[PDB]
């Protein structure tokens, strides 16, 4: 039912990398998907540009706050994914790069 442009519900970690490293996508291209790791958790996948590897995809676990909430680092939590994505879009604040455009398909 009408997901966000960056929400790829059932996309695996491997295809997330494959999709983000594909043409049309660039630095800061990202998506959020169900985590391969934990119950009801989600993971952030982001394409980043470095010196040695060139184009690469970095994956972050998005933790759940008991009874509601999300955070990547304990020093700043968010009531929802929209808040989390807006936050990291305007500031990397610890992340590898600022979130730019959702993965384009």
């Amino acid at each position: 039912l009408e997901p966000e442009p960056w929400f790829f519900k059932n996309l695996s970690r491997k295809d997330a990398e494959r999709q983000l490293l594909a043409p049309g996508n660039t630095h800061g291209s990202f998506l959020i998907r169900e985590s391969e790791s934990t119950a009801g958790s989600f993971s952030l996948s982001v394409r980043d540009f470095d010196q040695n590897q060139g184009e690469v995809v970095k994956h972050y676990k998005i933790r759940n706050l008991d009874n509601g909430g999300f955070y990547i680092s304990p020093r700043i939590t968010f009531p929802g994914l929209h808040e989390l994505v807006r936050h990291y879009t305007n500031a990397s604040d610890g992340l590898c790069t600022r979130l730019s455009r959702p993965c384009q398909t």
């Binding site: 993971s43 994956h59 972050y60 680092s73 610890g94 590898c96």
Partner: peptide
Amino acid sequence: FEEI
């Protein structure tokens, strides 16, 4: 998994 990358971390902040």
